[PDB]
Amino acid sequence: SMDFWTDAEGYYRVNIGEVLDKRYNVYGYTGQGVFSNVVRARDNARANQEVAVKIIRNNELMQKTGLKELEFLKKLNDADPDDKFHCLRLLRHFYHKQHLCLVFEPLSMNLREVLKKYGKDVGLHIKAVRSYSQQLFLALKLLKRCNILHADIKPDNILVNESKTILKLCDFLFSRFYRAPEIIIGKSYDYGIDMWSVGCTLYELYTGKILFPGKTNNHMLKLAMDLKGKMPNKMIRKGVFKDQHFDQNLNFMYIEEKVTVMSTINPTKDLLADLIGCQRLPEDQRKKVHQLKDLLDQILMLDPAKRISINQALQHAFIQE
Template sequence: MTQQVCEKLGPSLYDFLRKTAYRPFPIDLVRELGEQLLESVAFMHALKLIHTDLKPENILLVSSEDAKLAENKDGSFSKKVPKSSAIKLIDFGSTAYDHQDCSYIVSTRHYRAPEVILGHGWSYPCDIWSIGCILVELCSGETLFQTHENLEHLAMMERVLGPLPRHMLERADHHAQKYIRRGRLNWPEGATTRESMRAVLKLPRLQNLVMQHVDHSAGDLIGLLQGLLAYEPSARLTAQEALSHRFFRRHRERRSL
């Protein structure tokens, strides 16, 4: 009988965050993880494959070893980080070819792109949106869109990123039309509870959210995230374009000096 053995890898990025009480990763580590993730997705996209379920649970650290960072004045250490930044992308069970039916719902809720929720269909850019959500989570320690309901999810997007384009709302399929009223999102009128309204109102704008957690490279990261989280799929950066963004390029140039 033939046996298949998988290599032993470390915890997922989600499990590492959970183990460290959801403390944000240092920005330089976020950069290294983001670059590897984009390289993996660029390779998939070049093969005409769309992952469709990118999330921290599906990104594994190669090593399970920790390192301690930032010694405090009393001699204690304030933060644990992975000893190695090497990662591997897993779970290709939902992967689709670009020519397959792209009308069904994909992606785990919190990382789902607006075109998927609105029923426009999807393609490579849905992976790019998920990467943007993941990078925010790594640098903040918190899921960007912590919700389980479509209208609230779209309202959270508008709170963080600004109004959804009217033409995208007008193209919503018959399932999503109930979220739109008179050419705009039916919010807060359509909110089901006051708790839902408060969950949206507490979210900061993208720029403010990043600057709360990032002490250097904040401007470059904000620019990258704006490209990854563009509402219109055709306006989003490709994985290859994102790898050439100054957030990564400037760091590579400094390392080469």
């Protein structure tokens, strides 16, 4: 998230049965987190309630990064005192053996794991996609209110409770698939990047498949333009990486090594067909799928200024009808 060898040293292995801050009885690992150990504990000081504790590495870079994370979470916590906007709740922090330790509400699994348990190319029920879409847009609403850009929304960064009724947005290879085109071309960017990533996620939640599985940044742009046609001229010109992907005449240079020069990219991606799949749907679910397709069309505009607003997303037929 962002405001709109000594870097890897100091890992701490917490033992099962260790008590932290004279209260957190560590009883299990989670596996989550990239650089820090995230453990499950019971809070002996608060009726043995379950928490997750992230133990950050003891080095300068990750200490400072930890403090920034703490600041972002406190800002969202204060902006949303009743927890209606679906961001992860930090409970408090402490220090242990020079490690900054962050204590969070416990959650069950991330949405990548939920998709895996649905099985290969299966996806969720459209009713769950509807509910999760609303919750995600509410998270977007809070982030924008707090002048925060996530910049890496994807199933791996969304956690759910045990019943899978509630999701919380959080932040910890796959990242390229969810990247907005303004980022790829190197244009100045805004809250629109997170709306884009939410669109990519929603498609994947329903189909079980990655929307834009591009091997490179060049391939990602081609796949986006296969949906929406060629990127606007004014957008191309403002990108600091435009020369990797477009020539002096703003023709797209499709790499496949061979370079195919394209003045036009005819839209060919059939989003509805891909959404429906081999399903024989009843008219009520079929209607909802059409509405999902329309929501995605409005999210996945190449120009971020022309994407659906957060409020228009919340009031879209997919959610409301």
